[PDB]
């Protein structure tokens, strides 16, 4: 029994171009717990943090991967996670309308 | 505070 992770990419406050902020990769609902989450500045890794492993009452785990950033009008941000239920590393680009 | 449990399966 194994479910695959949902992923949301979003800013902590609404995006204001060139005003410091926080970008969040929320990885939730997955099992088994082993998982590979990477925040990426323009298709290359960012230095980020990771909250402690926890799980819901249905036992599916969840994590937050969060680094500070300053949005620009040009730079693309992305989250990349790997998991046994994923044939191919899944990528969600950051839409700042979401 | 945690539960002190000599809890084996």
């Amino acid at each position: 029994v194994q479910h695959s992770p949902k992923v949301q990419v979003y800013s902590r406050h609404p995006a204001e171009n060139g005003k410091p902020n926080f970008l969040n990769c929320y990885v939730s609902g997955f099992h088994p717990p082993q998982i590979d989450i990477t925040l990426m500045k323009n298709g290359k890794k960012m230095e980020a943090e990771q909250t402690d492993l926890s799980f819901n009452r249905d036992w599916t785990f969840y994590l937050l991967v969060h680094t500070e950033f300053t949005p620009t009008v040009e730079d693309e941000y992305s989250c990349q996670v790997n998991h046994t239920t994923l044939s191919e590393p899944k990528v969600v680009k950051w839409d700042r309308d979401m | 505070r945690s539960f002190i449990e000599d809890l084996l399966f």
Partner: protein, 274 residues
């Protein structure tokens, strides 16, 4: 209101790679306040919310003492189970455990729970009466046997009826300004073009606490939440939460709509229109 203290343990086998990982975390309601990783040098159980830190050093040693036994005890449990099932010692497997208590508005003490899953499937659980065990399969019945001969339910019942509800009480006083204060969401509704013919219409609620919330979308007074896309509430980072709900709509017809956010800290529910 109503509150709960819970603890969440996780044990993961990493075949060939030394010991299994044992993570442990503590929650009062929706705010994490403790953690323990067995991948840590000289590893102790570190605070994770500010209101907890002024507890005596005795506490912290007494806890990492307990956390260290749990990691030891579990790594054997992984082994025990893997043979109840005859799986290969090369497989990665996970054992999860959860316990805690819910206390009522006056501290009534509503439920105590204590549950254990193996690889994400229910394994054995304490029952509502805090005196019996539901055991899922023939392997878990052996555990149920062991735990019935030792009076294990009785140790747990008195932990969940006394130590739990008492220390919970202690925690909320310490974090009186943090935990007992709700945080109303920031509402706002944006509009995102899709075409000449229709447009996404997002309803945002940001920065609220606690995590529970409801968003609702009403066309012409209807209740049109049927078509709406609601993402699942997500943490904000600052310890607050977010969620939004979109709709897609014929042009011109934006003024046809309403979004409604109900939340514990909203003195009366707010509704908004474009």
């Amino acid at each position: 209101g109503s509150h709960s203290l819970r603890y969440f343990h996780t044990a993961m086998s990493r075949p060939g790679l030394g010991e299994p990982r044992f993570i442990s975390v503590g929650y009062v309601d929706n705010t994490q306040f403790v953690r323990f990783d067995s991948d840590a040098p000289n590893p102790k159980m570190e605070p994770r919310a500010p209101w907890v830190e002024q507890v005596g050093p005795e506490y912290w040693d007494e806890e990492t003492r307990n956390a260290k036994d749990n990691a030891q005890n579990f790594r054997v449990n992984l082994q025990t189970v893997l043979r109840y099932y005859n799986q290969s010692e090369s497989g990665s497997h996970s054992l999860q455990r959860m316990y805690g208590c819910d206390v009522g508005p006056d501290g009534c003490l509503l439920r105590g729970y204590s549950q254990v899953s193996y690889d994400g499937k229910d394994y054995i659980s304490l029952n509502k009466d805090l005196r019996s065990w539901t055991a899922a399969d023939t392997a878990a019945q052996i555990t149920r046997l062991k735990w019935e001969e030792a009076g294990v339910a009785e140790q747990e019942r008195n932990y969940l009826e006394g130590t739990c509800v008492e220390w919970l009480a202690k925690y909320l006083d310490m974090g009186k300004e943090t935990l007992l204060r709700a945080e109303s969401p920031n509402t706002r509704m944006t509009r995102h073009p899709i075409s000449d013919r229709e447009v996404t219409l997002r309803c945002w609620a940001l920065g609220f606490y606690p995590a529970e919330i409801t968003l609702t979308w009403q066309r012409d007074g209807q209740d049109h939440t049927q078509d709406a896309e609601l993402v699942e509430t997500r943490p904000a980072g600052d310890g607050t939460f977010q969620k939004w709900a979109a709709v897609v709509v014929p042009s011109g017809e934006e003024q046809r709509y309403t979004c409604h956010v109900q939340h514990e800290g909203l003195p009366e529910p707010i509704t908004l229109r474009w």
